Design a protein around this ligand. Sequence first.
Ligand SMILES: Nc1ncnc2c1ncn2[C@@H]1O[C@H](COP(=O)(O)OP(=O)(O)O)[C@@H](O)[C@H]1O
Ligand SMILES: Nc1ncnc2c1ncn2[C@@H]1O[C@H](COP(=O)(O)OP(=O)(O)O)[C@@H](O)[C@H]1O
Ligand SMILES: [Ca+2]
Ligand SMILES: [Ca+2]
Ligand SMILES: [Mg+2]
Ligand SMILES: [Mg+2]
Ligand SMILES: [W+6]
Ligand SMILES: [W+6]
Ligand SMILES: [W+6]
Ligand SMILES: [W+6]
Ligand SMILES: [W+6]
Ligand SMILES: [W+6]
Ligand SMILES: [W+6]
Ligand SMILES: [W+6]
Ligand SMILES: [W+6]
Ligand SMILES: [W+6]
Ligand SMILES: [W+6]
Ligand SMILES: [W+6]
Ligand SMILES: [W+6]
Ligand SMILES: [W+6]
Ligand SMILES: [W+6]
Ligand SMILES: [W+6]
Lengths: 413, 413
Amino acid sequence: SPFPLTSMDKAFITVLEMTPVLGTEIINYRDGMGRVLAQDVYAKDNLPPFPASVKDGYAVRAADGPGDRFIIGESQAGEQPTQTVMPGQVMRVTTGAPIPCGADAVVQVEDTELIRESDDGTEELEVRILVQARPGQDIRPIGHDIKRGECVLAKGTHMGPSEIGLLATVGVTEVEVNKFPVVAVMSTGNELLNPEDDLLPGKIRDSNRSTLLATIQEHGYPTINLGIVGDNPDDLLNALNEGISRADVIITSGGVSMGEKDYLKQVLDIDLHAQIHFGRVFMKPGLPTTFATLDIDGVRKIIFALPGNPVSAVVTCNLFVVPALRKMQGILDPRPTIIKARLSCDVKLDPRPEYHRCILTWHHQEPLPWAQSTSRLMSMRSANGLLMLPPKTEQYVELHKGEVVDVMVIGRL
Amino acid sequence: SPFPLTSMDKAFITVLEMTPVLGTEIINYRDGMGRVLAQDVYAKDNLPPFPASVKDGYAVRAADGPGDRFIIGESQAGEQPTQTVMPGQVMRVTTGAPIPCGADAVVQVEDTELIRESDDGTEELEVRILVQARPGQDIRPIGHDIKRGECVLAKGTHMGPSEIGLLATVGVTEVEVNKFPVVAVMSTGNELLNPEDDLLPGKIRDSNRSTLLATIQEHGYPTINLGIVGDNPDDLLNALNEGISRADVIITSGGVSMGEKDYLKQVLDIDLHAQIHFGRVFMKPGLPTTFATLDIDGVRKIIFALPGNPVSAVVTCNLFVVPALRKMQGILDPRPTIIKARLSCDVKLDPRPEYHRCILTWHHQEPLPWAQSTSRLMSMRSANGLLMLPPKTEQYVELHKGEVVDVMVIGRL
Ligand SMILES: Nc1ncnc2c1ncn2[C@@H]1O[C@H](COP(=O)(O)OP(=O)(O)O)[C@@H](O)[C@H]1O
Ligand SMILES: Nc1ncnc2c1ncn2[C@@H]1O[C@H](COP(=O)(O)OP(=O)(O)O)[C@@H](O)[C@H]1O
Ligand SMILES: [Ca+2]
Ligand SMILES: [Ca+2]
Ligand SMILES: [Mg+2]
Ligand SMILES: [Mg+2]
Ligand SMILES: [W+6]
Ligand SMILES: [W+6]
Ligand SMILES: [W+6]
Ligand SMILES: [W+6]
Ligand SMILES: [W+6]
Ligand SMILES: [W+6]
Ligand SMILES: [W+6]
Ligand SMILES: [W+6]
Ligand SMILES: [W+6]
Ligand SMILES: [W+6]
Ligand SMILES: [W+6]
Ligand SMILES: [W+6]
Ligand SMILES: [W+6]
Ligand SMILES: [W+6]
Ligand SMILES: [W+6]
Ligand SMILES: [W+6]
């Protein structure tokens, strides 16, 4: 029947509550960007694993105090020194080099004066130490940064470049992570042609498939292109069955209003036997947005049947689909970032919550960004926000330039 | 010699001023994410290309007024109607369907009552129109959204999903764009082992290469892994020559301070014959950061020789390298987004401007985010900002929790 109007808050919670978290797999750490760890990661070595110089200078005995010293040799990075530093002696050290036995502090070269070098001038022989070194000064002790057996990354961690670096550091080059969802995208309608086609009478080009696939790809998830499907229940069923076989998530657009050749809801329920959780949402745009799940064996497939209007499709994809994908790939709090911004122009409110693509810009020293709903130069930039306008009331019927509003971040700022 | 201390502002401007914009290439529109158009793009068709219904309803003659009408047929999406609507008649239409000849308005189904249908109930025969239609109501005229010959995207546009959708819409499936830079990354030092290696005496694992490659990959640029190179001028030269052959940009780390086995600056100048624009920057961390260019034939190569300390390397990569890469790939204003945030803890200022990775978080309804320099839960998130602290003065020697500071965005918020 005509599905109940579902509130935006209920629809959103329903998507998150009903979306599964995918299983795990082992990956190479270099492939970890944007992955969520499904294991704790432990250090199997100390960092540094030897006492290491913080400075270019000399390894000394602090008890020697300031004075003139014989340079017995050099500790070079990458090699364990063999000599022991005795009273009256020092060893040259470079940053990251091991501290030799017998030394207990480092004096940086700027707190020294060279006395004697070799004739060719390539070897230092004697040096004046000008300061009283503090015990342990300018040395990183064994384990100062990381200790053997320390947990350096917890399960649940959403990895960026520095986490990949940490895995490299501790030598943990394979890790268990959640899988990424595979997302299949289909367009529907007898009027649709491919982008590559010249127009024919009564027809237009399919843009949603491209826009949706790009949106998903921007977030790093693998995609499947299911093409254009006609307004025909058998064709829709066959396409959905392909999507279900090939992917974790199916996204369709078009054919979800109550029109005569809108078949998707019927096919989902009667033919595919999916559970439709909502089929209308009280929102602008996006009224006919539909969310269904299908359990086959012990696997839950998710299906988003988005409106056909191109603006509606991209808006609802960002509101509903992206957070579900984030939950599927193991992100613990998959909610989008919502920031406060100032309206750049007056806006009339609707009885429905309204959503509009916008561009966020910071002005000089002003603390809040401005939100400009999509000058010449502005066109050089792609939308990076979704303005989230409140429903109207007897009190508030309009918002004014400068008033503070919620904006969901949808692109790299 | 010991290079002059360059201010942060000068170093940053120097990088942008000396970095080239790469040439152009033709790509398929599906590959356009993050690319910058090097051509204006024009529509070769109207959108819609026929007069199109906005609603499910009936195509009517407004001059008929309200009343009872014979339904002569249906205009279905994807097909040009053949019948003409005469006085006293209407045609069913669906959203996106063409308006038949003879009709000049659409009345939505909710403003109608069905009078008669076929016995099987699959065909509507007569309908009551309850309203006086406004001329042209609920019709998108030819060219309403886009006109043939209109410029729909300007050169200089940095493309996201909606721009890809627009290309699909107008059927422009190949476009001229700036090339992306290819970025080669090398680590240096005799003490370094690969991540895959067990430790040996005096050695540590190479983490910078992984962190830097991931940082670059996060921005979408192709990379080349040049491996680990020893503290040896000949090996460094050979590696740099490989990077120059294989890539547009070379990033090294390590070996740029004035230590005894730090050879990079010498190799760059004497052996590679590159022009070093700065070799020290008055900043914390990142003092020894070095930027050079090399012109070969009519091609300018860029070389960033970053400090070896892992925190310094990732900070300077975000401050200097990423903006240069953005200029190379044709972004007109390649500067990073800097936002205002509140300090989550007291901080002492240094004579040098200081930079620290942080996490930005919005709290409930507070307009400004909090910046937390890198609770348990916080560790689940990767750094998304770089705190930019001002140099100290006689006046300001510390900043307090809650004070507003600049933060450069370095991850998806
Ligand atoms: N893939 C697409 N690309 C561009 N326009 C589309 C696409 N799919 C549908 N449309 C257009 O969106 C409008 C609404 O389509 P429709 O199928 O009625 O959406 P729904 O029934 O889901 O609300 C129509 O003008 C239709 O031509
Ligand atoms: N790739 C790397 N990974 C981890 N640590 C490194 C790496 N390269 C250098 N380091 C460490 O950074 C510190 C500084 O190295 P160094 O080569 O002296 O940097 P610079 O001379 O450029 O300031 C030393 O402790 C060194 O071991
Ligand atoms: Ca349709
Ligand atoms: Ca080194
Ligand atoms: Mg429809
Ligand atoms: Mg050094
Ligand atoms: W230091
Ligand atoms: W240092
Ligand atoms: W709408
Ligand atoms: W709507
Ligand atoms: W609509
Ligand atoms: W509407
Ligand atoms: W409307
Ligand atoms: W509506
Ligand atoms: W509408
Ligand atoms: W609609
Ligand atoms: W420092
Ligand atoms: W420093
Ligand atoms: W330092
Ligand atoms: W320092
Ligand atoms: W310091
Ligand atoms: W320093």
